[PDB]
Amino acid sequence: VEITDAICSFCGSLCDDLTVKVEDNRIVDVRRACRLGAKKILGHERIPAPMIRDGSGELVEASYDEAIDRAAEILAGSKRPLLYGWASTSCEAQSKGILLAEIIGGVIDNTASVCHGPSTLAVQEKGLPTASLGQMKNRADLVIFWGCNPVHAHPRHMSRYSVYKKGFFLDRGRQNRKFVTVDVRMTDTAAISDEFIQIEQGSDYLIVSAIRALVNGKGDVVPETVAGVPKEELARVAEMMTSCRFGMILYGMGLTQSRSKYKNIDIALSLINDLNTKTKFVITPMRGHYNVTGFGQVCSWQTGFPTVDLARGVPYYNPGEMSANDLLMRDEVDSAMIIAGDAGAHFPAASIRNLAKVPLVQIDPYPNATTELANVVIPAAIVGIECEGTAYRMDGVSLRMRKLVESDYLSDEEILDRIIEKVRVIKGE
């Protein structure tokens, strides 16, 4: 059977035009998906059953109830429990994680803390001037990829929304647009662009500050060279920005994880605001996982904040104090649950050294680096492949993930519903 209108479960592009061929409950072919999406949808060797680490230090097979009960006991008996990941599961499961965090008085953090968290901090300072991806597809004649490598990170972004597509107001496609890339190294995204602005590492805040000064007609305060870039080149960039009919900045980890952090995005948000006094201009963070955006949406409408610490029975938000790596670097976490995320492989070594000393529950379909530190391992059915769910595209558009194959594994929603019930019995609620 062919399942049409299937949705990719890998990157924030959340491509919803895939067709999947299923034979004997196994995915055989994936149409239009890029290598990243096809590999995820085609699958790998998964965790066959739940497991609990014994005294010997080995992971022994256990029933789903035994693993869930051990997870509930670990979490209910903790004073500073951390629930991290969530970006690769559905909004329905994220909602249950927020409810569980409230009952156990824990900290629930998304992969945003190590990704576009600084973007949210900048948006909380200036606001986000953005648009749905179809707007740029149909009108953008200028597209700047700032600190993002979509050729390797969002492979179909250029062919589906940002460059090669023909729009209602762009009858030819790529020839109707000028794309630019700003990076510290010549990436494959930069090689194919109309212009590549190679800048010094960690100099984005200065470069954007100078470009904004030139856009506002205050070039006199800009020196001859800013972080190795000539003023005349910055003036040319400002000219391209003010002379376009519809401009869009697509930025990534090059601004959020480099020096100055959120300060890089808020100056860019001020540049976009100022540019709207000359022409139409928007900006969009190139969100990572297919549902990192979804957690921030659910957590915000249910608690008022994108990430939250519910230790005192009331939402508390403050990155730099209650983010996963802030708590682990301070060695204040006494238990952790890693779900739909791989902390062991994607956190700095110093944080792992502390995470490896606390009881850890892992809810994941595949064995990874976190499994090496897990005391309880619970295999889960994959959202967008084995079960339905809601996910948010990088531009805030929510879509319903489609179930492609049947599975006997429990979904994240079901695993969390069972942990919540058991925790409530322990807590007396």
Binding site: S78, R80, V221, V222, G320
Partner: protein, 253 residues
């Protein structure tokens, strides 16, 4: 005067929120009443007595109440939060939010202070003999105004975002300051005796004085004629000009 001496009787690794340690709350209370003061060890609602041995000497008003913490408390947060008078002497390090929202009195930290020390300070005095972490004298996320008054003096170094969204008061750092001190300054006076970089991004009004080296300047300042402050020649700048600001940035020549 009333003197309350709190001696750490434990060393939990979990952060303890103790916004109730203020001369305002301790004034007129018995040792037992001070021991029953609520503190939060993570999600564990408990009492101050469980973490400190409480010794009292006298009974007076908050202005005449002095709290002495004998030892480092690097995991006790919000100490002195919202205090309006009195003294808090910490004989060691302190966790985040020390003197947060304080309106009066004085807090002396003999050791280092963690992030958000003196955040949203409205008045009073905060002295840190050691170093300070991030957001020294800054505000809370999304707030247009942070520190509004008072004086913070750090004898050591301070990290990034010093005085972020400052609207008044004074910050003095005797050592070096991290990245971007004085962000969006709107009435505050910041003094850094040591080195720093990228000061006064989007400043609208106020004064930033740096006696050390400024590695990089944000390309948004208009250089003015050098000016002498008490006989010392300083390079003078006005900005952030892109943000319509007219604050002054002085860098020693």
């Amino acid at each position: 005067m009333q003197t309350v001496t709190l001696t750490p009787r434990k060393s939990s690794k979990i952060s303890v929120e103790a916004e109730t340690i203020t001369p305002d709350n301790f004034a007129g209370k018995t040792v037992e009443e001070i021991e029953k003061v609520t503190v939060w060890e993570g999600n564990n609602k408990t009492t101050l007595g469980e973490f400190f041995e409480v010794a009292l000497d006298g009974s007076d008003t908050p202005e005449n109440t002095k709290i002495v913490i004998e030892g480092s408390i690097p995991r006790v947060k919000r100490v002195g939060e919202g205090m309006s008078a009195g003294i808090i002497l910490i004989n060691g390090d302190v966790d985040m939010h020390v003197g947060a929202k304080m309106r009066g009195g004085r807090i002396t930290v003999k050791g280092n202070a963690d992030s958000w020390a003196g955040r949203e300070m409205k008045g009073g005095e905060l002295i840190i003999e050691g170093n300070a972490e991030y957001y020294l004298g800054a505000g809370y996320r999304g707030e247009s105004c942070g520190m509004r008054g008072g004086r913070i003096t750090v004898f050591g170094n301070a990290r990034d975002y010093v005085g972020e969204h400052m609207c008044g008061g004074e910050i003095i750092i005797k050592g070096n300051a991290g990245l971007m001190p004085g962000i969006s300054n709107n009435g505050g006076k910041i003094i850094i005796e040591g080195n720093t970089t990228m000061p006064g991004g989007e400043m609208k009004k106020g004064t930033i004085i740096i006696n050390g080296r400024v590695d990089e300047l944000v390309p948004v300042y208009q250089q003015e004629e050098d000016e002498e402050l008490d006989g010392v020649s300083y390079k003078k700048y006005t900005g952030d000009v892109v943000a319509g600001g007219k604050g002054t940035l002085y860098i020693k020549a």
